[PDB]
Design an enzyme around this catalytic site. Structure first.
Site: not given
Lengths: 238, 238, 238
Positions: A10, A12, A86, A88, A158, A164, A204
């Site tokens: 993706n 960013k 996703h 987000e 995901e 984070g 990630s």
């Protein structure tokens, strides 16, 4: 036994130059195994990606399509892949299970290959609700699909709970989640569908821990951020 | 004397590496006075900022929450600050005084510290309506709040009369506006609330005007762009 | 003879510093002939560009509109030029001919100078529908305008069919498009309006190709990406 892996990345943010530099890198990456690579772009960068990206194992994806006309415009532009659900979007743009499900069905109807994201939050995982949350999310999607449509569907797990935190899910945690999803698909959709389904790890990772994650029986690839190390992520699916 | 100053910086654009490097800078920055530093991010960058930023005097802020689900996702993600009614929202997206006031009230209700932005256009200012315009904006916010809620409110004055037209306001112009706002809060809400309220300057701040701006009687810090020079903006609040 | 040319550039993405360095370049450039230069960006960059841009033949534009109702507030913020109807908006953001028309008229009534984009897709060009499509798009815009409004309007012919192909229209291809647009304007609106109308070539082009394109009878300038080479595009309108 494993189906064809997918490595997907993706965009960013950053300059057009930073993107064209990545494209040059990918165009010059010789990949010896069967893998579908996917570069998911924002609208403003689709033109430059279409213009410069040319590699037999790379396709372009959209990150969003907010209306029927956008889907149709994407298809007319030769964009055949899309990322949906996703975190987000689910977290900040009001995308419920049903909204995501409707978008997947719509995109499939339009002839897109869809990478559909599902995953539980920190709060959800800690209250022991990984299974019900993730299976409810995939159930919602399946509600709006026919058995045949699954050839156009890729699932990304995901690990929203890990976002984070600086920690990658252990291969054991990832496998457990991917296994959970496949079992549901096998039982509710079909053993054939489950076998063919790509379930990507959407946390990630670097090249080193991606290789180890790929050793897991129900991991079929990755959905990561676009950067030079995406080349390492592709290789990790060998 | 003045309450705790606030130095707040807004992400505008650039690569994830650029943000990463800025975070490295801030993590290693020595701050020897009582100041709350704030880094306001867009959604896509919230994950890296949470992952990498760790300074006792820094918190993360969102720049928007378009719906109730978004506020809740932010709070669950540990984002406890939000910037509302900033110039993009008011002048591009057309958020009215009331929409902004409703957003501030909802965020406060959900436990956020809110930086609420107000400011008048050059037409408003040149036609002698700075006071009625700016104070009507804050009046709309106050209507939706109780006195106790002001402990969770911060005001930012964005002189869009200057920003949008290529002018840089003087410390005297900044002071006069801040003094107007403070007298309004004193009169309407209470002298107690007024003395404790942080009113941040959100116009053009550089390395030569920052200290003179901070030393204005009614300025309690800044709302500026994220840049390495933010370190010096923080220093100016000592 | 030809009316005053326009050289317009759109900022795509990347750091504030990268844009600021371009503004510095533009500020130091002699531009001797009569030309209006336009730098268009997203809202977040307006503050920096307004603050630093000094070239007397440059003005600042918003890269698009939000809703037509919010154009007045964007004018009051301080923006005097705007680009409407760009393919990205038409393709991905649901902006029909009629929505574009409404935005153009609303921008004109609010006192903007407007660059309104029109152009046919690859599918439309291949199917022989260049003229019908382009003239339908401009007819929709004209339906909401009065003759006097055309003084505030500029047309960009965007060769939408070429997007993502890495090829520029030939001078013959561009001239044909621009001439049929002007012919329509002459007959439907007025000969004098058509003579004064600026019709820009709205595809990316370099200095040399731009110079050859500008030699065409009905080409009045360019709408391109914001990069160092924009200086040569400006020079190409000599």
């Amino acid at each position: 036994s494993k189906p064809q892996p997918i490595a997907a990345a993706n965009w960013k943010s950053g300059s057009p130059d930073s993107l064209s530099e990545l494209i040059d890198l990918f165009n010059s990456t010789s990949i010896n195994h069967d893998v579908q690579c996917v570069v998911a772009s924002t609208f403003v960068h689709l033109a430059m990606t279409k213009e410069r990206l040319s590699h037999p194992k790379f396709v372009i994806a959209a990150q969003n399509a907010g209306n029927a006309d956008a889907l149709a415009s994407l298809k007319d532009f030769g964009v055949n892949w899309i990322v949906l659900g996703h975190s987000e979007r689910r977290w900040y743009y009001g995308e419920t299970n049903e909204i995501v499900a409707d978008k997947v069905a719509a995109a499939v109807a339009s002839g897109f290959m869809v990478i559909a994201c599902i995953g539980e939050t920190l709060q959800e995982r800690e209250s022991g609700r990984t299974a019900v949350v993730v299976l409810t999310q995939i159930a919602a999607i399946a509600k709006k699909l026919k058995k045949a449509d699954w050839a156009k569907v890729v699932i990304a797990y995901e690990p929203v709970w890990a976002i984070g935190t600086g920690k990658v899910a252990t291969p054991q945690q990832a496998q457990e989640a991917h296994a959970l999803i496949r079992s549901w698909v096998s039982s509710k959709i079909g053993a054939d569908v489950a076998g063919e389904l790509r379930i990507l790890y959407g946390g990630s990772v670097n090249g080193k821990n991606a290789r180890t994650l790929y050793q897991q029986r129900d991991v079929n690839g990755f959905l990561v951020g676009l950067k030079p190390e995406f080349v390492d992520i592709i290789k990790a699916t060998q």
